[model samples]
Target: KVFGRCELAAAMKRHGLDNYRGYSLGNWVCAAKFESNFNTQATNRNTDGSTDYGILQINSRWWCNDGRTPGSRNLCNIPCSALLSSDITASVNCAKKIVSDGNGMNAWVAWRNRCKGTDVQAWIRGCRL
Candidate 1:
């Protein structure tokens, strides 16, 4: 599958992310596989009746309330899906932030380490700006 490098780059820039291009690609592919099986428009319901959407399975109502509309309001008052759907780069960048914030790609690294016959996890885990 071809991952959108330009899209991912845009996502990263919006979120103040820098470096980790290769790592971001690896993690975005991995996360998409794990999250929604690469469905760019996937959606699901949470226990609280909230909705999630997009390839990364970001919550639509929470992330991009109106879907593809610029500056959609977020429930928490932050920009929703601003990082994911504004552009391909932003989407990948958003994914990078999610992974970085959550265990810093340890899980993804471990998966790649066991499956790809290399310590990819270490590369991301140890990645720096």
Candidate 2:
């Protein structure tokens, strides 16, 4: 399922990401925009033999067990398929763990390239938090 910008923002906020780890909701919305455009089914293969899944594109190498990423840590202890759910609960949970890790949200390349140090006010401008 694909979500509108504001819709995803609201959904993420409901999942407790609004100001998780000091990152604003707009920062998350910005990363999701580049990662998967709020699509629950989106998937991307990394050159590092990992695949990203779901809305925020959680990586199989560390977060989920996909059986395809060699040496996968499965740190999130979830099946990669769980990330494909439109509900986004499992995906959001896995993301929370990732952000809680030492790398923080910088674990996401999209966030670093597209959202980091950028003013994301526009991403959630009209969205009522």
Candidate 3:
């Protein structure tokens, strides 16, 4: 489902994104804004010739399968479009799995570019959490 940034922040908090897999919710929210601007349907064609899927923009080459990604690893064993589900349950679980497997939020390039080693209070600004 489409989400406002504040709503996304609230949801992430409810999901217990704080220090998830040793990363912070602030970073997660910042990365979400940078990756999708809170749009669940967001996708991008990566330079690595893979597609990014849904809000978390899970990559097709190593994480999930998009029909077009013939060389996909499908490590998450999920169809990339499944990440687009409005409930976000699958996507959040998959994301946690991804981090626990040792990649951390570095799997999210947006996290690196926008949130890493930077102040991220803006991402959670005005959110009660």
Candidate 4:
């Protein structure tokens, strides 16, 4: 589920995540890098007994469904497994929806903690997309 940076940039451009929900493409890329290192199958267990899933590292507590995680809100109505795959449309759309819900990039904790003040352009440096 690891997309090359340039390929990821292309896909992000195609889906308009660069400008979607009033956020920049570079921040999206930066968040992806910090959250999952661009690996779609990435998962991280949170202290809340929930797990983050996919390249965007969406949490099971409030977003997508992770059948095994108790208290999963399933707001996105998609299985956690689906988010772990290479097809990013669902992830991107879900992310936009989350942002649209008034979170902005705040939906991603990594974005606020690590990516927010960085030189986001480096996430797609030389990718030309």
Give candidate 2's error at residue 128 in angstroms.
2.1
TM-score of each: 0.43, 0.95, 0.89, 0.91
Residue-by-residue lDDT tens digits, candidate 1, 1-129: 233544433444455544363354444444555555554545566665555555566544444464454445454333444533433444554445445554554534323444344432332343232
| lDDT, ranked from best to worst | 2, 4, 3, 1
lDDT of each: 0.46, 0.90, 0.82, 0.85
The predictions' CA RMSDs to the true structure, in order, are 8.0, 1.0, 1.6, 1.4
Ranking by TM-score: 2, 4, 3, 1
Best by TM-score: 2
lDDT (Cα, tens digit) per residue for candidate 3, span 1-129: 678777887887788787877677788888888888888889899787899888888888988888787688988889888888776766787788778776677878888888889988767778787
Itemize residue pairs with steric clashes in candidate 3.
1-86
Clash count in backbone of candidate 2:
0
Off by over 4 Å in 1: 1-24, 66-90, 93-129
Segments of candidate 4 deviating more than 4 angstroms: none
Global fold similarity of model 3 (TM-score) = 0.89
> What is the alpha-carbon lDDT of model 4 when measured against the actual structure?
0.85
Q: What value does the lDDT take at residue 48 in candidate 4?
A: 76
* Higher-scoring candidate on lDDT, 3 or 4: 4
Candidate 4 C-alpha RMSD relative to the actual structure = 1.4
